[PDB]
Symmetry: D2
Subunit: 334 residues, 4 copies
């Protein structure tokens, strides 16, 4: 009575998805794939700088590793098509490598014998893109390859839904103050992608960087396609981020208290609500996809012209991971 | 015949002001006041974590200390009215303690015998708030107490002025992503002003915080009074900051190129312009009050309806200090 | 039913000791004192940059704050001698302010009505300095004022005791690579105790500093009095530290293996043992006083002459606090 | 007649060497090779997070880039034997990739037409390891491939030389508290060489790591072959490092003053001396290979048995680069 999951890419997302899946009955990681030995894998599962020590027991054994009395088969294969997914009976591949972010590229897992693929990032192609608790009812089981969207898109989507539904979204800009990630360099150095900002010492700088999140929000919410854009600022915290959205609305005479009350009313397991004066380190490890922060809501009015600004915290690691694993369980049921 | 300056608070701004004044002909620092002794004062002047070693000879003498063959007397007197300003024929106090940011309170320096005071911060009371090269001309010689505004206000004013003069400023919101400062706690601990966010480990968090830069811009540019608002996020870089501004403009079919060009045309020694993809560490020690970054200009257009975003860097330490010492020499000569 | 505890100084060690007491039956914190209000105290209890969110619920109430249904009384009285310790029937004060670290200073609490005082630091005067599971046995219940030693002494003593007992300590030198603490400055600035290195930006430097842990070890282990000395390097992690000790011994032809086994054989709840290649963030929140790392044992031999190096991790915050609370329970039950 | 230098690997050491060479007449960098494009090489030369802005002007041109009016040719070739060193009359290659750290591999540069190769690290094979002003006089002219030693070795050699000549070195152990480097990971992730410690987030951790600097000291000072060993602790400063050495000496009754005078007596342009209480950010950019800090000197005596401890600072970046360049000029001169 268990969905067989494979994780491809035992990185920040793959390993935390593993932690998360240890709490979900009939979701079972049976295999992992990465570019390293089992020793490295076990070690990175047990010890995690920002996320804390793994909550149980990990042992390096023959096939891969032993976790809480259950065998996880391990692989070191960089080509997905060469994976023994048929032999292992893989129900869902959690695609967390970063190198398969596309319907066609990700098809490789289907070939290998897996039935479904959920990608842990935006992907290109004829795919559904899903934010759990905003978007997931759009799934139905016809789907073969699915995208779980991005960390920022999951912090942003439910905020933007309330704004448009209650106020009419005219247009908006976003800046996310985002923790630095592994694709940024440790020291100033050539960047494999040619990006002169990601090339810079990650933990020593405020770094402007591109994001597709707001420009691509149409994918999870069609009613506001092309109404939002924005960028990121990468700063020196290792995880935990903040999304800031500035919008023009159709409804006039909107107040700070109307905005906060309408977000609080939309709150759920995915969309948290707070009025405490928290900081980034306080959301590290949290499982809400987006935590709306009422202390940061601002309204600028001049005559009949208004600018409305809001902000929501997210552990770009764990908040995204928890949303990804919610979508996985729902996807798997269908 | 040289202007005689006393620096109250030999802190980050006060010691960098000391460095600047060594470049300005006919300004001399004859005295310094703080809460410590000469061993500490000299040492902090010689070694500076973010701004580099001070170049000349610094020796502790009987007066206080000697810098490059020049005597600076020093005192350790928390009560400014007891300072010997009359005896030393002080022309201007640079008030950099953070404890006299008020016209009435700053009057303690005038009672002690200084002719004028220039405060290194926003200040309450019946006084002028001055951004060099935006409104320093508003000074006419009859001022005894003057505020040199804030780092953020200095980064924001020339940008906001061009937006209004060239496009018609309807309204706008600001975020400044600001390096952490000395009023933040090293570790989570009770905060002296009761701020629950400045209570937190400065170097381990993105911390939201208030700033009056946009709200009180009318003091510097009266014609856009009440048109801007916004706040700050304090992040773990030790100096160097970015101001992001989102606005609606009367001019209707705005392009990135029009905005970038209007800014370049306003550049001078206070207001720089760059087209390079820089990060915060690149502005450390710069002497522009504000460096416009043309790579971060965006125009979001939905039908006839546009939002415009711009960003300008500032070394909140050295950019602010270079501006303060310019306003200082100008005020002295009046 | 429970020993009634008051915490003087609700700082890092105060708050963590509060959290730790929640989990030790027979101990109850009935009051807290600091220099702040209840809004701030409840906030710092609930939220913690490195140590994570408080598990229970916390609420400001009229005399203080309620934690998990229990009322804690709070006060903000800088002079210990005025605290209503008599009417609260306080059994022990945990003295965690940093301002009463001497026997006669701490006596103020006794005069205010506490039965006993345990100071969260080295302390001067006629008192016992106690590291739990190395020498707490020297307490006989009759003590009025006791020192819980330092984080570094607690990391060091069990290690030094094994080296001496099993190999005969001749002499040795220590360096502790130690997380930065609240008594360092956020930015370069005058330091209160005139210390020119603690003056420096804590999160941006390696900073040599003094410590007495090794030189005063004799207070904890009399038989090696005078044999150890050494220092600290403060570095940019917010908590988590490592004690390295290089010794000369009486035993000859000593091997890495004999040293590791001796250390494992002495392991208990205060002295941990590991062979995992962990790093500082891995010890954040651990409740061992000292965590011996067998991967860092080195022996240098030249002919008949050897130097033996070892290293033991500690969370200078939580390791020390768990040692404190054990000594507290022991002192109270006598 | 100016020496013609090609730099292989335009990274931290290669870029800094390029900058340092602009300060040294007789030496001309004519070519640069790496794995990126001209836009990125030029940008990373112009901007540098820790070492500050390049003083020169830099322009991308058809062959490469122009620096102050002189053309530097640039190549994008991973196989060094395919490089056009004979066409360009390369006198010395500065091999700074990390990928040719071997006599036989480095020979690819000579095959390709360069007269000599100087490797920016320790190297395998039958070649000499040079720390300038300690053993550079061992270069007799016949050499074609040479090692510039490591940053730690350059910090340690002049210190160990004095201890041995003046006091007779019996044995010693070393710990270097070292800035994180580019081969450590930004976030916890699998590591290229299977190192479970360089795997972990560089800027969030104290990370033990192995160094060959002490153990291989004998290649630089043969008289002390085998008498030193030790390791490293990598910490969250982006550059700037400290070497502590703990030693047994033949000379008895050694004092702090004798050790300090003896080090002051050996100072030169490679080996600096200070009595100021500095921290790591104060050495960033310094051109001494080793800066002895007299404030950190300690002598432990127990009867007739002493341990002596010293510490020397180095900018692992610029201290080593300035040494490498001195060795370059010397090696070129014969
Ligand atoms: N904040 C975040 O870290 C964040 C949030 C949401 C989504 N994501 C997305 O999740 C994906 C993974 O992100 P991450 O943060 O874990 O990065 P990461 O580098 O930690 O993880 C990538 C892992 O995949 C492995 N890998 C790389 N190529 C492989 C291959 N071809 N076959 C098998 N394994 C391979 C690597 O060894 C590495 O461990 C990315 O697409 C990223 O954009 C990241
Ligand atoms: N990014 C920035 O640091 C920045 C930018 C612009 C303006 N400012 C403003 O300038 C002022 C100083 O800021 P800072 O960053 O230099 O802080 P700081 O703490 O480094 O400097 C304060 C100095 O004043 C001394 N001092 C405090 N009270 C005193 C008193 N009563 N009498 C004499 N000396 C006293 C302190 O010992 C300290 O050296 C503040 O008002 C701040 O708002 C700071
Ligand atoms: N690594 C560590 O942080 C650590 C480890 C072991 C021991 N210690 C020791 O424990 C003590 C506290 O350390 P900390 O890191 O928690 O410091 P901290 O600054 O976080 O806490 C000190 C607290 O005492 C307060 N205070 C309360 N009442 C006071 C009063 N009555 N008079 C004066 N000050 C008062 C301050 O407001 C503050 O909250 C110090 O002795 C320190 O050396 C600290
Ligand atoms: N503190 C230090 O950074 C330090 C000090 C002294 C010595 N070193 C040594 O110097 C060397 C370089 O270290 P770094 O810190 O500058 O590293 P780095 O990563 O910044 O630089 C290496 C550069 O070489 C390039 N490269 C890699 N392979 C190449 C190839 N085959 N052909 C051409 N270019 C290639 C990379 O793109 C990169 O720009 C290493 O041996 C290192 O151990 C480092």
């Amino acid at each position: 009575m268990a969905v067989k999951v494979a994780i491809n890419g035992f990185g920040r997302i793959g390993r935390l998805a593993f932690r998360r899946i240890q709490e979900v009955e009939g979701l079972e990681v049976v295999a992992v794939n990465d570019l390293t030995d089992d020793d490295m894998l076990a070690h990175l599962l047990k010890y995690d700088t920002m996320q804390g020590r793994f909550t149980g027991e990990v042992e390096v054994v023959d096939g891969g590793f032993r976790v809480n009395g259950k065998e996880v088969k391990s692989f070191s294969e960089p080509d997905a098509s060469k994976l023994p997914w048929k032999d292992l009976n893989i129900d869902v591949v959690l695609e967390c490598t970063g190198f398969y972010t596309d319907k066609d590229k990700a098809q490789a897992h289907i070939e290998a014998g897996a039935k479904k693929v959920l990608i842990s990032a935006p992907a290109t192609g004829d795919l559904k893109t899903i934010v759990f608790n905003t978007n997931h009812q759009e799934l139905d089981g016809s789907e073969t390859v699915v995208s779980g969207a991005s960390s920022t898109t999951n912090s942003l989507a439910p905020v933007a839904k309330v704004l448009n539904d209650d106020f009419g979204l005219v247009e908006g800009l976003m800046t996310t103050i985002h923790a630095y990630t592994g694709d940024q360099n440790t020291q100033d150095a050539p960047h494999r992608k040619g990006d002169k900002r990601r090339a810079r010492a990650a933990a020593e700088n405020i770094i402007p960087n591109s994001t597709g999140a707001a420009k691509a929000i149409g994918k999870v919410i069609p009613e506001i396609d092309g109404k939002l854009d924005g960028g990121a600022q990468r700063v020196p915290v290792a995880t935990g981020s903040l999304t800031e959205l500035t919008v023009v609305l159709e409804k006039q005479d909107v107040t700070v208290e109307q905005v906060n009350e309408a977000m609080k009313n939309a709150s759920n397991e995915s969309f948290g609500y707070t009025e405490d004066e928290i900081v980034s380190s306080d959301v590290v490890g949290m499982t809400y996809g987006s935590l709306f922060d009422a202390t940061q809501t601002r309204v600028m009015s001049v005559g009949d012209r208004q600018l409305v600004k809001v902000a929501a915290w997210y552990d770009n690691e764990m908040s995204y991971t928890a949303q990804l694993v919610r979508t996985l369980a729902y996807l798997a049921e269908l």
